[PDB]
RNA sequence: AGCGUGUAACCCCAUUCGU
């Protein structure tokens, strides 16, 4: 290649690039209307109606807010959104750290049962020899 | 029954007869802000709240000025407000941090939705 | 010194890399791997087991079953919709709302 | 790089050990500034005394 | 009409043609 003028050309498909995937959402399960009727009353799904419609004469005008309290009300919701996220994030950190601790614990009882059977093993033989004498006197009493 | 009802209107003699104030939308707004004080300052950390609900007996007031703390600890009268929520509305440091955190969550959530 | 052998082997930490969708088929979407397929595979398996559980319960359903909730609620196309409760306003109350609105 | 010098490695272990101890116990501090509060909550339900019997 | 949640013809009324 150096002697001639041949130059390396790299395939674009063969090169490695970041994938940059996005997480996947799935539709909710749909229960056929025939199945819902066939289901027993205890297992029947029960839902609430929307009932959005209201008659013109019955409906009332909405509250009109002054700009001052809207500043206060928007501030509280923004503070509530941040606080709710912080507690939920801290919950997972507590959940994760407790998980390895329980996993760390289970290793010792697996080791602990190993010394349990070996120590009991030497004592077990002495008990077994006593049971032999009970065979000869089993018939007599 | 009537003597029970009279005794629940006050905290009791152990705390010199504190009364339970009537709950309003301005009093409830202040108590909700106090519960969520952990997220106001990223560099300040607080202990867990004593109770999940609101206290039954409480009172609202302001700290008296002291002549000795003229420079060390005193807020000018122009900066003082009537309520806790209005104090949060006024200071620039809390507003600047909160809007950045809130926008970040929504920008994250917009990507989450898509 | 089995651990010493393993430590020498793991001196290099470059891992094998993932290949992407070919360019001439880019409009189709991302090339799914085993981790991507497992998400949609477990989702379908989750729903089918639930539908089989629902269908089996329909077999031993007793048409003569009775509940006191049945007296005040009627089915709509077989679906049990809980209708919202009424307000039961009175004419005197109705006249007060309209005066407050104006 | 910290493994190259054993003396500075022991220095870092002590610094972490004091940080980890802060969770277990409270460090003593003087009143270098006028008292203005706890900087945190005051929990009235926690009882940290030791019973004698 | 009736089966089928993975990011209607046929029929019917009338119009035209024609061994």
Swiss-Prot record, chain B:
Subcellular location: Nucleus; Nucleus, Nucleolus
Cysteine disulfide links: none
Position(s), cross-link Glycyl lysine isopeptide (Lys-Gly) (interchain with G-Cter in SUMO2): 19, 28, 56, 101
Tissue expression as described in the entry: Widely expressed with higher levels in testis.
Described purpose of this protein according to its UniProt entry: Regulates the transcriptional activity of DNTT and ESR1. May function as a chromatin remodeling protein. Part of the small subunit (SSU) processome, first precursor of the small eukaryotic ribosomal subunit. During the assembly of the SSU processome in the nucleolus, many ribosome biogenesis factors, an RNA chaperone and ribosomal proteins associate with the nascent pre-rRNA and work in concert to generate RNA folding, modifications, rearrangements and cleavage as well as targeted degradation of pre-ribosomal RNA by the RNA exosome.
Assembly and oligomerization: Forms a ternary complex with DNTT and core histone; interaction with PCNA releases DNTT and H2A/H2B histones from this ternary complex. Interacts with ESR1, ESR2, PPARG and RXRA. Part of the small subunit (SSU) processome, composed of more than 70 proteins and the RNA chaperone small nucleolar RNA (snoRNA) U3.
Protein name per its UniProtKB record: Deoxynucleotidyltransferase terminal-interacting protein 2
Native species: Homo sapiens
Higher taxonomy: Eukaryota, Metazoa, Chordata, Craniata, Vertebrata
Gene name of this polypeptide: DNTTIP2
From Swiss-Prot, chain C:
Region (Disordered): 1-26
Cross-link (Glycyl lysine isopeptide (Lys-Gly) (interchain with G-Cter in SUMO2)): 74, 83, 86
Subcellular location as annotated: Nucleus, Nucleolus
Domain of life of the organism encoding this protein: Eukaryota
Modified sites of kind Phosphothreonine: 90
Family (UniProt): Belongs to the UTP11 family.
Complex and partners: Part of the small subunit (SSU) processome, composed of more than 70 proteins and the RNA chaperone small nucleolar RNA (snoRNA) U3.
Function: Part of the small subunit (SSU) processome, first precursor of the small eukaryotic ribosomal subunit. During the assembly of the SSU processome in the nucleolus, many ribosome biogenesis factors, an RNA chaperone and ribosomal proteins associate with the nascent pre-rRNA and work in concert to generate RNA folding, modifications, rearrangements and cleavage as well as targeted degradation of pre-ribosomal RNA by the RNA exosome. Involved in nucleolar processing of pre-18S ribosomal RNA.
Name the UniProt record assigns to this protein: Probable U3 small nucleolar RNA-associated protein 11
Full-protein interval shown: 1 to 102 of 253
Swiss-Prot record, chain D:
Post-translational modification remark: Citrullinated by PADI4.
Subcellular location as annotated: Nucleus, Nucleolus
Region (Disordered), start-end ranges: 1-40
Basic and acidic residues composition-biased segments: 24-35
Entry similarity comment: Belongs to the SAS10 family.
Description of how the protein assembles with itself and partners: Part of the small subunit (SSU) processome, composed of more than 70 proteins and the RNA chaperone small nucleolar RNA (snoRNA) U3.
Protein name (Swiss-Prot/TrEMBL): Something about silencing protein 10
Organism: Homo sapiens
Complete-protein stretch covered: 427 to 479 of 479
